[PDB]
Amino acid sequence: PQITLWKRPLVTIKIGGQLKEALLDTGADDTVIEEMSLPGRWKPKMIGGIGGFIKVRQYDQIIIEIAGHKAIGTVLVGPTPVNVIGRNLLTQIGATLNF
């Protein structure tokens, strides 16, 4: 797919059998999703965005489908205002920016 940017680049993701909406975000290093349950252990992480730092739960090697493409990697869970797919998983689905 070729996604233009006149609207937010929102896609359907599937994580834990659940469909969610997420933003494809080239300005995010990491993928951050709103509070949900994920399996296994987590490790702490602080991430810094526009407004300041937040604490998140880091889950590694999580299976996630993004716009129909399978990825397996790190998912951060915390109080983000929107689910964002960051570069760690955009690279796994082969995404590039083009102009």
Ligand X SMILES: CC(C)CN(C[C@@H](O)[C@H](Cc1ccccc1)NC(=O)O[C@H]1CO[C@H]2OCC[C@H]21)S(=O)(=O)c1ccc(N)cc1
CA distance 72 to 82: 20
Q: Which is nearer to a second copy, 5 or 40 (CB)?
A: 5
Q: Which is nearer to a second copy, 15 or 32 (CB)?
A: 32
Please choose, out of 3-11, 37-45, 51-59, 63-71, the segment that lies near Cl ion by the rule CB under 5 A: 3-11
User: For residue 68, what is the DSSP state?
Assistant: T
- Residue 66's DSSP bridge partners are 13, 69
**Interacting residue with a second copy among 13, 32, 62, 77 (CB under 8 A):** 32
Positive/negative CA dihedral, 93, 96, 97, 99: negative
Per CB under 8 A, 53 contacts a second copy: yes
40 Cβ neighbours under 8 A, 6+ residues apart: 59, 60
Q: Which is nearer to Cl ion, 34 or 88 (CB)?
A: 88
Per CB under 6 A, 95 contacts ligand X: no
How many C-beta neighbours within 10 Å does residue 91 have? Answer: 12
Footprint on this chain of a second copy (rule: CB under 8 A): 1-6, 8-9, 23-29, 32, 47-54, 67, 69, 78-82, 84, 87, 90-91, 93-99
